[PDB]
Design a protein around this ligand. Structure first.
Ligand SMILES: *[C@@H]1O[C@H](CO)[C@@H](O[C@@H]2O[C@H](CO)[C@@H](O[C@@H]3O[C@H](CO[C@@H]4O[C@H](CO[C@@H]5O[C@H](CO)[C@@H](O)[C@H](O)[C@@H]5O)[C@@H](O)[C@H](O[C@@H]5O[C@H](CO)[C@@H](O)[C@H](O)[C@@H]5O)[C@@H]4O)[C@@H](O)[C@H](O[C@@H]4O[C@H](CO)[C@@H](O)[C@H](O)[C@@H]4O)[C@@H]3O)[C@H](O)[C@H]2NC(C)=O)[C@H](O)[C@H]1NC(C)=O
Ligand SMILES: *[C@@H]1O[C@H](CO)[C@@H](O[C@@H]2O[C@H](CO)[C@@H](O[C@@H]3O[C@H](CO)[C@@H](O)[C@H](O)[C@@H]3O)[C@H](O)[C@H]2NC(C)=O)[C@H](O)[C@H]1NC(C)=O
Ligand SMILES: *[C@@H]1O[C@H](CO)[C@@H](O[C@@H]2O[C@H](CO)[C@@H](O[C@@H]3O[C@H](CO)[C@@H](O)[C@H](O)[C@@H]3O)[C@H](O)[C@H]2NC(C)=O)[C@H](O)[C@H]1NC(C)=O
Ligand SMILES: *[C@@H]1O[C@H](CO)[C@@H](O[C@@H]2O[C@H](CO)[C@@H](O[C@@H]3O[C@H](CO)[C@@H](O)[C@H](O)[C@@H]3O)[C@H](O)[C@H]2NC(C)=O)[C@H](O)[C@H]1NC(C)=O
Ligand SMILES: *[C@@H]1O[C@H](CO)[C@@H](O[C@@H]2O[C@H](CO)[C@@H](O)[C@H](O)[C@H]2NC(C)=O)[C@H](O)[C@H]1NC(C)=O
Ligand SMILES: *[C@@H]1O[C@H](CO)[C@@H](O)[C@H](O)[C@H]1NC(C)=O
Ligand SMILES: *[C@@H]1O[C@H](CO)[C@@H](O)[C@H](O)[C@H]1NC(C)=O
Lengths: 489, 723, 50, 97, 149, 198, 48
């Protein structure tokens, strides 16, 4: 009735075609179900659950489960971590050993660099057209989650994922307790680690900007699964069975989640609410999670905090479902269904129009406070040399009654300084007035409004993201995405 | 049973100044029931006129002895009142045409102008025309496929604008428009029309014999695929052919001794071309022209007493067909085991037998596999054939599949159909107006549908959910199904009852009763694409044996919608696609603009669907706006190629690899009934049309007359040549 | 709304002149019959030159 | 600059720690020393917090100070300093400035 | 001093002068009702706006003056913006000089159904809109003088 | 077509003035008038500061019926001012139109009284209704060819144009011309009215 | 230069800002006031 109407997709079963699998199947190593989506090749996706499905289409047709061809001894075929490298290759962590799979071909490759058993593969993928961040998407970390930093080995690769070399332990000599992951924080152009000394945990930064520096500590009950937002803005989501946290910064401040109900907000603790989140889907700006007691929650993740509302009820949870953001404002619940008469899996899909969904009078959400937000800086990526400045522009038309407050910010303030002017020019035929804001960007040192503890060198290149947003934007502003661009000094 | 009529065919004119003629038929009648705003003349008469000035919806019902249903009719204030009338004449010596145009008001026009039989304007039309020249209104004609305009001269002594026009046969679609000068708060609507060479219907020699359908069978009708109002209709008593919308008709007969009397009453199917007519008499194909009645035989590549059907194209892709510069098949016949592709001049070779298809479909051989119906899809160079598969027989259930054949690649493909049907049911299928093949088929008791790339496959069902149409029409079998460019599909019953379907919509609509149970009727198209019902009855004075009346399908659908409670999800959807065929060379791209306007946050978008062998890249730029409680989304897309031919090997091979034709269609995300938008479907071809070349200035072929030459050149080559 | 019309004095084909009274250094800033005679002579010269 | 655009909330609480006055307004007094002012972002929680300041000082955002007379205009910038230890923004201005 | 370019009156120009193929345009902008159109208006590829709010132009002495008009609709702002371009037809008004060849001709611009009913009520009274007559004089105006360099 | 834009001037009107500095006071403005025209539309509007005052238009054009006697005072060449605006004159009479050229009439003439051969000739747009008694004898034609049987000294169809002025008493058209220098010449300055069209 | 923006029904003919001078004898004030499409009032004053 409401939200989704189910629709079943199945092909290839027109006639008596004898198709059979060959080898040992692939299965996930966790109770939850996930959908990993490639950044710009968004048609290619991997559903990880009781069976693993690699689709080149957007989960159309009937997909055979991913299989190991037994030519190499993989032991137990349990997947712990998956990653998408640039090209036609996908990386899996099977039984502690790394493997590469080509999906255009049917090629399996064994990663020979790693010796000690790792559990997780991490990296960042930029796919702006060019040759700049193709090299950025080649630095990858291989590490074992839950280990002890004194004693354990961590590997890295700069030639994509061909050969893996262990890094020296001199840098990580003074960190004591258990590691929670090591990340190439390209928003900071830094290297960060998540560290669990006690029931609470924190973040450590290596490189000279804020070297030997700390972030605000946060509780670390059980393990955590860490999800980056794919626009290099540093937005971080840390979720597990009984907790969820959002880091608006790159790990400097990690905070809780708000919940909106009857025009009042409250902090959401999963354990105290006595719920269990089953699936998590993350867009560039949005976030959603399915709670296993047939519940769906949608939130807009931004600065000042994240507001999360509860969507109307629908019996969606069926022990195999997984949510994924098909598009902005378009969620999709996917459930694979087996079929032994043809030895194949078909799919059931719900296309959730959240924009149409959030108009129920029981919710009564105030409409959007901004009428138009448009700029031309989202198409490409911008580089700066020293003694060179650049300018970007944006146009915003606000609502008739409200008075929204825009704000522009830089991911990495240490090597990127801005000055933004917002001037009013003209007005629309209704009477609402256009506002034009232009930002001027250069290096942080040349401004001279920072300390020596904050400038953090000028001779080294770096990378950051510039974002224009509305500070007091309400919910239901799904389509009016804030503007973001990538700029390398 | 009652109905109503209006003076004008075009429904844009329909407003408060119009009159509605209400006609009730029945033994019992009392009066008419109307709202207070509208008025009826002689309210105690079953035939009357209705005038109403206040806008809105009005509920009218004829009160009588029995139960008569009420009807809600919408009258809206409009500023478009007047209409164009045109009269053509053709000269062949100059190979051109001359048209005479004047302005007439449908409310106060002559009878002949209302039926398109006038040659001279009446008094009111002439005075209004000279008033429009005085206030300064001038028409002009604009060809659609290629953007050329033609202007008239001054007004003659009587109200008439005379325009000369080249004889094209490639851009047959034209519009006529005018300036923005209005008279007394009333405008004139633009008029769309088509014209090509005037075709001649055949004559009848004395001593000939009629060709009829078997007795008790329904009456058949077939028309030309490109230009309407030129058709042939077969009844139980006569075969008629019309150069018009059956205003004037001529009989079609056969020479003596060619066919038996029993054979002459066993005519199964008829197809009409410009060259001649084709009859399927008892499984044998006969070609009737103005000269002879020749029976096709093995010399032309057909089998005898084995043909079960034939078909032609259904969408006028005349521009691509003319620009292909290669004569292709114009007809496809099927004989349950073999298909044939009939070209021009009515001779052909066999296309495919069932053995090759059995080999193609990996069947285990010695199976009952049959071909039963072949249709030309919207893509010009492919065809589709319905395959019936027994699956080791011994039951009544047969699998129904589709197989497509591509003439450009000479290949075959099997699609996804999972239909199980009994032995008895016969099937007839049609393609809808879409780039993606969407199939509507019927088996004289049910209608099933295949939408959205053969994924939404099922049975069209009633709102009650019976899914059987004979039960709601007292046990009778499906007679006629008509599609159109818009996407509304009309199912006509032999009981003469009415069902309505919309493309990409599963639920059907049972229309109200408009025509008698016993009436011999057929549904056809006028000069425009509106619905007309033709009534045939013998035992008359030869002048009213065929009477045509229009059908207000849009108004009846609106009344049904006010009964039900549906609405269109989007306010508006605009696009800049003004053509159907787009051809560009290596160095140009194509830019398409579109926009949707809808309520506040019912999240929509524009679906772009493609078909063919993709050789292009898309770039899409989106703009979003909210204003006055409404959302506007604007899309700009660009199609282009990004290949290089410099310093490469196999240049011609890459040139052939990067050529072909593409089909694109634009549509909203979700749409329902009461959305009268036309879905834009077009085709884009890359390559040369073989009509563009290079001339040196000052040179021409035969502006300079000369004679034969001869010369010898020697000792200067790279010994003695005489050229 | 009516917009983008030509400004009237350059399209309706008119010719314009200005003539302002002279600055008087009196504290009250009032004129006299003498200075208005001077102003009349000045506006006469303007019309003559026109 | 829209004068009656609408102002209803005081987002900042600043103090020079020399003379305390009503917390509903910011009154500062200038003497021979450097005018030293500590200021914080007042919100639903009226106490100073290290979370909001760290959020602000991550996008390269620092407060600005406009002093105006009937004939004079001047602007002063809070320095960008890491939020590792501090709680409120601080600025000291020489008197000759 | 003599006023070449200044900041004069706003609104409609009073009268016009034309000479041998020159022209002028007026751009009109109408703002419609909040719910002036329904979903039933979505009948074609482009919205038909003439049935509810249409703009018309009538000419007198039509065989010497040509008018071309063109609309555009923005339903988000409930606006229709149209340009009317009026050009000389290069005939009539026989060859003369300065003040002889001119013939007077009044064209009418209007929006349909507006005249009489609608009114701009401002402070201190109300003014009639929807219907405005502009006169042009064809021929050649004053001001155009020839001199020797 | 030419226009002149000026700003007015302040003028302390001369008198006893018991006050010291500020006193009776009235703005004054020059008055140009070019050669070749009569119709002068004057437009008065505020500078922009001060109390609000509206915008007005006036017409002081070219009153040209004026003769000077030996004593040196104004006199109408058409007639003499000798009557009183009694309210009785048009307390029951109907509404009478006013005919002149489309814009170029520098004067205005209107009669149509009960029985008095008087008009309401005035400059401007009857802002200043100065009555007049015409010095035109009261004549009536004779017989046979003619009949008109009732003088009724009430100028019916009192029309005018630039220069000439036309009145119609009973079957008698009389035509006057005002002296209008800088328009044509001194020439057709009429001595007095003339019965024309014999 | 100033811009004046109405928030309700605005007086189109009468300008909404009246300006007064304390001492007109020492200062010369030339004012221009024009209107926008949406009745936004642009004014500018030159003082010498
Ligand atoms: C189920 O419903 C079916 C649908 O109605 C029924 O079919 C009907 O059958 C009837 C008889 O079985 C048919 O009736 C015959 O019609 C002949 C037509 O002749 C001409 O008719 C037109 C128009 O007819 C009507 O006009 C009025 C006008 O207001 C309309 O309101 C009305 O709806 C209807 O359309 C007339 O205008 C003609 O008059 C002249 O026509 C000239 C053009 O040629 C024109 O220039 C001129 O100005 C005149 O207008 C004609 O009259 C009638 O002629 C038949 O009458 C007979 O005529 C012959 C020869 O003229 C006479 O010798 C004889 O005595 C008798 O008068 C007869 O009425 C009906 O047409 C048909 N319906 C249709 C749509 O065709 C079916 O029967 C129903 N079944 C059951 C079981 O109920
Ligand atoms: C192609 O050939 C035909 C031959 O009929 C041409 O039609 C003829 O065109 C001429 C020229 O206009 C007509 O002569 C005059 O036309 C004027 C039109 O205003 C009319 O007022 C005169 O009385 C006279 O008729 C001639 O009548 C017409 N023929 C007919 C039968 O009407 C046609 O113009 C040619 N087209 C081209 C493109 O060359
Ligand atoms: C509409 O549906 C049809 C039916 O599925 C789609 O046609 C399908 O297209 C894909 C891709 O071209 C074909 O996949 C093929 O797979 C083989 C290996 O199995 C590979 O070698 C080929 O190169 C190709 O990738 C698939 O066979 C084909 N299906 C059929 C029945 O022919 C079509 O793509 C759909 N259209 C759209 C716009 O989605
Ligand atoms: C009608 O047009 C005529 C011709 O332009 C005007 O008459 C001329 O006016 C000018 C200046 O007003 C006179 O010039 C003056 O001449 C005297 C005597 O020589 C000299 O002392 C002055 O310094 C000045 O130069 C000119 O003589 C006069 N011409 C004639 C024939 O009278 C006349 O003013 C126009 N009408 C009106 C109402 O302005
Ligand atoms: C980075 O350096 C700055 C230098 O100004 C440090 O600022 C200190 O601020 C406190 C309080 O205002 C003063 O008492 C100290 O004297 C300042 N330090 C110095 C060296 O002058 C700032 O605390 C430093 N931050 C970090 C994280 O080291
Ligand atoms: C690391 O930080 C310390 C102080 O925190 C500083 O003295 C040292 O120079 C830093 N080293 C590097 C390599 O950044
Ligand atoms: C005060 O002025 C000096 C001299 O220009 C400058 O260096 C210093 O930064 C100023 N202080 C502040 C707080 O701006």
């Amino acid at each position: 009735h409401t939200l989704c109407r189910v629709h079943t997709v199945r092909t290839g079963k027109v006639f008596k075609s004898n198709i059979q699998l060959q080898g040992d199947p692939l299965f996930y190593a966790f109770p939850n179900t996930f959908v990993l989506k490639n950044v710009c090749k968004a048609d290619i996706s991997v559903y990880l659950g009781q069976k693993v499905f690699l689709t080149i289409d957007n989960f159309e047709s009937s997909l055979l489960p991913l299989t190991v061809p037994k030519s190499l001894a993989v032991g137990v075929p349990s997947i712990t971590s998956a990653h998408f490298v640039s090209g036609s290759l996908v990386l899996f962590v099977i039984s502690g050993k790394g493997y590469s799979y080509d999906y255009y071909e049917n090629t399996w490759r064994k990663l020979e660099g790693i010796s000690e058993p790792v559990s997780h593969i991490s990296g960042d993928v930029c796919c702006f057209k060019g040759s700049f961040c193709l090299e950025l998407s080649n630095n990858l970390f291989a590490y074992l989650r839950g280990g002890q930093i004194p004693g354990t080995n961590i590997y890295f690769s700069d030639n994509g994922g061909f050969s893996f070399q262990l890094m020296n332990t001199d840098k990580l000599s003074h960190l004591t307790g258990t590691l929670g992951g090591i990340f190439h924080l390209h928003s900071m152009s830094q290297v960060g680690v998540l560290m669990v000394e006690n029931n609470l945990g924190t973040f450590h930064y290596m490189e000279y900007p804020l070297n030997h520096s700390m972030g605000i500590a946060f509780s670390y009950k059980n393990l955590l699964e860490v999800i980056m937002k794919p626009y290099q803005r540093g937005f971080m989501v840390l979720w597990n069975q009984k907790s969820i946290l959002v880091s608006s910064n790159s790990g400097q401040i990690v905070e809780h989640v708000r919940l909106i109900d009857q025009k009042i907000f409250t902090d959401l603790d999963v354990e105290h609410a006595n719920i269990n989140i089953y699936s998590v889907a993350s867009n560039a700006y949005e976030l959603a999670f399915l709670v296993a007691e047939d519940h769906l929650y949608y939130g807009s993740q931004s600065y000042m905090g994240t507001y999360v509302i509860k969507l109307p009820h629908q019996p969606l949870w069926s022990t195999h479902t997984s949510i994924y953001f098909e598009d902005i404002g378009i969620l999709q619940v996917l459930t694979p269904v087996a079929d032994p008469h043809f030895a194949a899996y078909d799919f059931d899909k719900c296309t959730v129009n959240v924009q149409s969904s959030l108009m129920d009078e029981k919710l009564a959400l105030q409409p959007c406070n901004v009428e138009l937000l448009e700029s031309t800086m989202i198409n490409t990526m911008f580089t700066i040399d020293m003694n060179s400045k650049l300018k970007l522009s944006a146009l915003m038309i606000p609502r008739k009654g409200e008075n929204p407050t825009p704000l522009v910010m830089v991911s990495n303030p240490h090597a990127l300084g801005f000055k933004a002017n917002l001037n009013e020019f003209g007005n629309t035929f209704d009477g609402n007035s256009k506002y034009k804001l232009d930002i001027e960007l250069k290096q942080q040192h040349h401004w001279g409004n920072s300390d020596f503890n904050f400038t953090a060198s000028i001779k080294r290149h770096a990378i950051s993201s510039v974002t224009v947003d509305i500070a007091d934007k309400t919910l239901s502003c799904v389509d009016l995405k804030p503007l973001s661009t990538l700029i390398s000094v | 049973l009652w109905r109503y009529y209006i003076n004008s065919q075009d429904y844009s004119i329909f407003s408060t100044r119009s009159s509605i003629k209400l006609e009730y038929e029945g033994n019992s009648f009392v009066s008419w029931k109307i709202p207070e705003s509208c008025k009826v003349e002689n309210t105690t008469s079953p035939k009357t006129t209705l005038h109403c000035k206040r806008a809105g919806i009005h509920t009218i019902k004829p009160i009588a002895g029995n139960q008569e249903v009420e009807r809600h009719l919408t009258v809206d204030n409009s500023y478009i009142c007047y209409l164009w009338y045109f009269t053509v004449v053709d000269v062949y010596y100059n190979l051109s045409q001359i048209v005479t145009i004047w302005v007439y008001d449908p409310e106060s026009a002559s009878t002949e102008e209302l039926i398109w039989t006038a040659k001279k304007p009446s008094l009111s039309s002439r005075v209004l025309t000279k008033q429009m020249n005085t206030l300064g209104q001038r028409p002009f004609i604009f060809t659609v496929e290629k953007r050329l305009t033609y202007h008239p001269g001054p007004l003659t002594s009587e109200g008439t604008w005379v325009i000369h026009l080249p004889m094209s046969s490639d851009d047959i679609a034209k519009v006529i428009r005018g300036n923005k000068v209005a008279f007394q708060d009333c405008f004139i609507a633009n008029l769309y029309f088509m014209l090509t060479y005037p075709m001649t219907i055949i004559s009848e020699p004395p001593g000939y014999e009629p060709l009829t359908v078997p007795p008790g069978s329904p009456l058949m009708l077939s028309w030309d695929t490109c230009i309407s109002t030129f058709a042939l209709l077969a009844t139980d008593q006569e075969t008629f052919q019309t150069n018009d919308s059956f205003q004037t008709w001529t009989r079609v007969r056969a020479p003596p001794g060619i066919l038996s009397d029993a054979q002459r009453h066993s005519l199964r199917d008829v197809i009409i071309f410009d060259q001649g007519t084709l009859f399927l008499v008892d499984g044998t194909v006969y070609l009737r022209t103005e000269d002879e009645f020749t029976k096709l035989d093995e010399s032309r590549g057909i089998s005898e007493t084995g043909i079960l059907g034939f078909s032609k194209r259904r969408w006028c892709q005349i521009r691509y067909l003319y620009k292909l510069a290669s004569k292709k098949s114009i007809l496809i016949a099927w004989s349950k085991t073999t298909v044939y592709a009939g070209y021009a001049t009515f001779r052909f070779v066999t296309l495919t037998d069932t053995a090759k298809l059995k080999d193609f479909l990996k069947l285990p051989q010695t199976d009952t596999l049959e071909v039963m119906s072949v249709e030309y899809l919207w893509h010009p160079l492919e065809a589709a054939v319905l395959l019936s598969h027994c699956s080791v027989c011994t039951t009544n259930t047969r699998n129904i599949r589709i197989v497509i054949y591509s003439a450009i690649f000479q290949t075959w493909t099997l699609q996804d159909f999972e239909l199980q049907l009994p032995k008895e049911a016969i099937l007839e299928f049609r393609f809808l107006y879409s780039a993606m093949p969407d199939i509507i088929m019927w088996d004289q008791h049910h209608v099933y549908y295949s939408y959205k790339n053969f994924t939404v496959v099922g049975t069209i069902s009633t709102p009650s959910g019976e899914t059987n149409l004979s039960s709601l029409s007292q046990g009778s079998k499906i007679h006629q199904v008509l599609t159109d460019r818009i996407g509304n599909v009309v199912v006509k019953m032999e009981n003469n009852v009415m069902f309505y379907i919309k493309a990409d919509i599963t639920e059907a609509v049972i229309l109200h009763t408009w025509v008698n149970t016993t009436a011999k009727t057929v549904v056809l198209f006028d000069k425009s694409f509106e619905v007309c019902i033709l009534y045939y009855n013998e035992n008359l004075d030869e002048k009213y044996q065929l009477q045509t009346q229009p059908y207000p399908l849009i108004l009846e659908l609106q009344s049904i919608n006010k009964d039900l409670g549906d609405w269109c999800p989007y306010l508006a959807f605009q696009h800049n696609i003004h053509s159907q065929f787009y051809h560009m060379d290596k160095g140009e791209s194509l830019t398409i603009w579109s926009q949707i306007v809808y309520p506040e946050n019912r999240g929509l978008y524009i679906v772009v669907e493609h078909y063919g062998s993709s050789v292009m890249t898309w770039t899409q730029n989106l703009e979003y706006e909210i204003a006055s409680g409404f959302c506007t989304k604007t899309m700009i897309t660009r199609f282009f190629q990004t290949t290089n031919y410099e310093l490469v090997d196999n240049y011609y091979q890459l040139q052939k690899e990067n050529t072909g034709l593409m089909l694109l269609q634009f549509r909203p995300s979700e749409f329902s009934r009461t959305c009268l938008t036309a879905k834009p479907v077009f085709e884009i071809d890359v390559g040369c049309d073989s009509s563009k070349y290079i001339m040196v200035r000052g040179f021409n072929k035969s502006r300079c007359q000369r004679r034969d030459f001869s010369y010898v050149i020697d000792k200067e080559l790279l010994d003695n040549l005489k050229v | 709304h009516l917009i983008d019309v030509p400004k009237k004095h350059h399209a309706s084909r008119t010719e314009s002149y200005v003539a302002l009274p002279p600055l008087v250094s009196e504290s009250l800033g009032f004129h006299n019959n003498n200075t208005l005679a001077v102003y009349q002579g000045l506006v006469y010269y303007l019309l003559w030159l026109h | 600059v829209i004068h009656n655009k609408g102002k209803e909330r005081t987002y900042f609480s600043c103090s020079g720690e020399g003379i305390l006055t009503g917390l509903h307004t910011i009154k500062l007094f200038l003497t021979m020393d450097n005018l030293k002012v500590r200021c914080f972002f007042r919100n639903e929680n009226q106490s100073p917090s290290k979370e909001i300041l760290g959020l602000f000082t991550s996008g390269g955002l620092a407060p600005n100070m406009i002093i105006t007379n009937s004939t004079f205009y001047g602007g002063y910038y809070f320095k960008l300093t890491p939020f590792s230890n501090r709680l409120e923004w601080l600025i000291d201005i020489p008197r000759q400035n | 001093q003599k006023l070449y370019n200044m900041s004069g009156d706003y609104g409609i120009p009073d009268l016009f002068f034309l000479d041998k193929g020159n022209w002028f345009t007026i751009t009109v902008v109408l703002l419609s009702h909040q719910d002036t159109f329904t979903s039933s208006d979505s009948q074609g590829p482009t919205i038909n706006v003439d049935k509810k709010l249409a703009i018309a132009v009538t000419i007198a002495d039509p065989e010497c003056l040509s008018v071309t008009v063109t609309q555009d609709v923005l339903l988000n702002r409930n606006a229709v913006i149209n340009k009317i371009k009026v050009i000389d037809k290069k005939r009539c008004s026989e060859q003369g000089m300065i003040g002889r060849n001119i013939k007077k001709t009044s064209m009418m611009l209007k929006v349909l159904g507006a005249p009489g009913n609608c009114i701009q009520r401002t402070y201190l009274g109300g003014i009639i809109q929807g219907f405005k007559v502009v006169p042009i004089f064809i021929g050649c105006p004053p001001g155009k003088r020839l001199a020797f360099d | 077509n030419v226009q002149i834009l000026m700003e007015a001037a302040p003028m302390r009107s001369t008198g006893y003035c018991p006050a010291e500095a500020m006193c009776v006071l009235n703005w004054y403005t020059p008055m140009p008038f070019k050669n070749g025209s009569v119709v002068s539309s004057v437009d008065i509007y505020t500078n922009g500061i001060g109390p609000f005052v509206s915008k007005k238009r006036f017409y002081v054009n070219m009153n040209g019926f004026l003769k000077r006697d030996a004593s040196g005072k104004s006199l109408f060449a058409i007639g003499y001012e000798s009557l009183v605006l009694k309210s009785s004159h048009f307390r029951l009479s109907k509404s009478r139109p006013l005919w002149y050229t489309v814009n170029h009439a520098p004067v205005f003439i209107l009669g149509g009284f009960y029985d008095e051969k008087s008009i309401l000739f005035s400059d401007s747009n009857f802002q200043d209704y100065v009555l007049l008694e015409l010095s035109i004898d009261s004549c009536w034609v004779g017989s046979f060819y003619c009949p008109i049987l009732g003088f009724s000294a009430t100028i019916h169809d009192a029309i005018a144009t630039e220069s000439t002025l036309f009145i119609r008493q009973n079957q008698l058209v009389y035509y006057f011309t005002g002296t209008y220098i800088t328009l044509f010449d001194k020439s057709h300055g009429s001595s007095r009215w003339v019965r024309v069209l014999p | 230069q100033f811009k004046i923006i109405p928030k309700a029904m605005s007086t189109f003919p009468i300008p909404p800002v009246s300006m007064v001078v304390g001492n007109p004898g020492l200062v010369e004030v030339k004012t221009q006031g024009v209107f926008d499409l949406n009745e936004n009032y642009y004014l500018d004053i030159h003082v010498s």
